[PDB]
Structure 1
Amino acid sequence: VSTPELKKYMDKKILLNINGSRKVAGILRGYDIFLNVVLDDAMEINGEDPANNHQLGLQTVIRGNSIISLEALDA
């Protein structure tokens, strides 16, 4: 019905936690009414910051059902 308001964030590097354990931080391009969020230059954060981190793809889309919280690291 109503679109979530992410409007200020877009174009800002954002960390968000998906479903049970996973945390993913990436630039955010698009959002829809289900909160499905597509962000580019995705990286999967882990305990060891440089080491266990692995990039995902050039463009990644996320189902809104697996989003627990969204925090934007930036202005």
Structure 2
Amino acid sequence: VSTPELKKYMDKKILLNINGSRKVAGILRGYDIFLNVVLDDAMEINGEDPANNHQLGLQTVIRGNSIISLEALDA
């Protein structure tokens, strides 16, 4: 019905937790009414910052159902 308001967030590098375990960081591109969030230059954060972190793809889309909290690391 109503679109979520991310309007200040887009183009800013953002960390968001996928499910209980996961945390993905990427530059937010677009979003929809289900909160499905597509972002680019995705990276999967882990305990060891440079080591266990591995990039996903040039463009990644996320189902809004697996989104828990969304924090922007940015202005």
TM exceeding 0.5: yes
Q: Which runs of 5 or more structure 1 residues have no equivalent in the other structure?
A: none
Structure 2 CA distance for aligned equivalents of residues 55 and 46 of structure 1: 11
Higher strand fraction: Structure 1 or Structure 2?
1
Structure 2 CA distance for aligned equivalents of residues 20 and 65 of structure 1: 12
Report what 1:40 is aligned to: 40
Q: Runs of 4+ in structure 1 displaced over 6 angstroms?
A: none
Give me the TM-score of the superposition, normalised by structure 2.
Answer: 0.99
* Shift in Å, 1:39: 0.3
* Shift in Å, 1:60: 0.1
* Shift in Å, 1:70: 0.1
Give me the TM-score of the superposition, normalised by structure 1.
Answer: 0.99
* Shift in Å, 1:57: 0.1
CA RMSD of aligned residues (A): 0.3
Give % identity: 100
* Residues 42-74 of structure 1: per-residue CA shift (max 9 Å, x gap): 000000000000000000000000000000000
